């Protein structure tokens, strides 16, 4: 059964590597829409699904242990076609894009830390990568956004300490970019790796939402950080704020958009008929 959660203002990331002072910039890119319904998976008994991608993924998680320990991206999650694997050791992340023969229920296996329960073939990978942190920099929310454009990925990440709440708190925090990988891979399906300690696990929970092409109005303060954003298709007042390019709308009528009824069907009448030039005499002579 599903279980949803309202994501209020989440998944706003820095669109480009450009410093901007106190400036309201109106951008148009793949953003997770405001006040949306993200899906609150548990996978704990053990049941983690293979979800679609469709346009990026916003992935939040609230886990003080180390269980959500990487991801699997691909198109068939099998051999014959390539797939991407992000595993997350205690010291370094190893991204690997090979023709993995992925198992049915993939998991890591810790005591020793093995890998042979995830896949069973590693033929012909053309990309390897090693960076240090990638994860763990009261409880702490960790948010990621994956999106694959043209041929190269993009992972945005932000780890923030939060108090006890709905695990997607009412606030704002911009996501800063982490890596930028030239993979050249069609990606449409993904799922999450876990660790099982050798069977028995703790209590996982992750929040998955999907990015859509939206127009945002981001507000950069003096130090170049994003403090607020307005989604230009969430109602009328947000459309007014995106028309004015401001966040404060004083009193009065403000013309924003245009209303133009569309069509519908498409009749096409003509004239009855007349002479019918008989093929009756040429196709049917005695």
């Amino acid at each position, epitope marked *: 059964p*599903p279980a949803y959660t309202n994501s209020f203002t989440r998944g706003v990331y820095y669109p480009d590597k450009v410093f901007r002072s106190s400036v309201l910039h109106s951008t148009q890119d793949l953003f997770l829409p405001f006040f949306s319904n993200v899906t609150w998976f548990h996978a704990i008994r053990f049941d983690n699904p293979v*979800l679609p991608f*469709n346009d990026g993924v916003y992935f939040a998680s609230t886990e003080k242990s180390n269980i959500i320990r990487g991801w699997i991206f691909g198109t068939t999650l*099998d051999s014959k076609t390539q797939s991407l694997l992000i595993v997350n050791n205690a010291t370094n992340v190893v991204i690997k894009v090979c023709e993995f023969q992925f198992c*049915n229920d993939p998991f890591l296996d810790v005591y020793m830390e093995s890998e042979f329960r995830v896949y069973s073939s590693a033929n012909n990978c053309t990309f390897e990568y090693v960076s240090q942190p990638f994860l763990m920099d009261f409880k702490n929310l960790r948010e990621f956004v994956f999106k694959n454009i043209d041929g190269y990925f993009k992972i945005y990440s932000k780890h923030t300490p939060i108090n006890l709440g709905r695990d997607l708190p009412q606030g704002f925090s911009a996501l800063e970019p982490l890596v930028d990988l030239p993979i050249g891979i069609n990606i449409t*399906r993904f799922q999450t790796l876990l660790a099982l300690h050798r069977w028995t696990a703790g209590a996982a929970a992750y929040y998955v939402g999907y990015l859509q092409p939206r127009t945002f109005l981001l507000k950069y303060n003096e130090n170049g950080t994003i403090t607020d954003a307005v989604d230009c298709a969430l109602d009328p007042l947000s459309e007014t704020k995106c028309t004015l390019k401001s966040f404060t709308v004083e009193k009065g009528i403000y013309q924003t958009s245009n209303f133009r009824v569309q069509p519908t069907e498409s009749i096409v009448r003509f004239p009855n008929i007349t002479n019918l030039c008989p093929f009756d005499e040429v196709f049917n002579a005695t």
Partner: antibody
Amino acid sequence: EVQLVESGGGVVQPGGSLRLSCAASGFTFNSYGMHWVRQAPGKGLEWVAFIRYDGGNKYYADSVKGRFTISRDNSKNTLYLQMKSLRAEDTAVYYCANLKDSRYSGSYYDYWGQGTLVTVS
Amino acid sequence: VIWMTQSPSSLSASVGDRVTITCQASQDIRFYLNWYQQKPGKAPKLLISDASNMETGVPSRFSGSGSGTDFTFTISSLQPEDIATYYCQQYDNLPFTFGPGTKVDFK
């Protein structure tokens, strides 16, 4: 535990109009691009339409491109097929399908509907 | 439009026998082809995805092979619940096209 219940089938005069509705409840919906598939009585399965996860791109079959429109309402989790200018070659059983694609929709589970008998007489 | 043909469109074989069903395309579909089974009176249940990856909840009698233009559905033994109609599907070019479907029967 998945439920795809469909409605809107009945006797239609030729050249009429219908709104086939597919109420989806179970999986998450709106993360999957969903399909309309039809089967003529005594014939094989045909294909009608496909819509993406956000209602962005819609694709139709090469025989019914223009007489049908496909839409989705993610607030109530429904699929809709507006059928206008029906001929007698459209009397069928329409299924509301979620095909185990893996190239376009990127789904992984195969969830079929039940099928409505649209008789155009 | 990617036309598909299926052979043989009529088939009758007893228990324990083997059934081969060839799906032939008009264009090139690399390994993107689904094999469905529809028992008469119900919605079709999928059996094989991407022409070789058998699913979960299906017995290991069925197998799929082939690539390019020719694909093959193979039933190693006919149990009495194998009597249905089997369909293809392609995935590369929209629209997706099903096959005409082959009917398996008992002798």
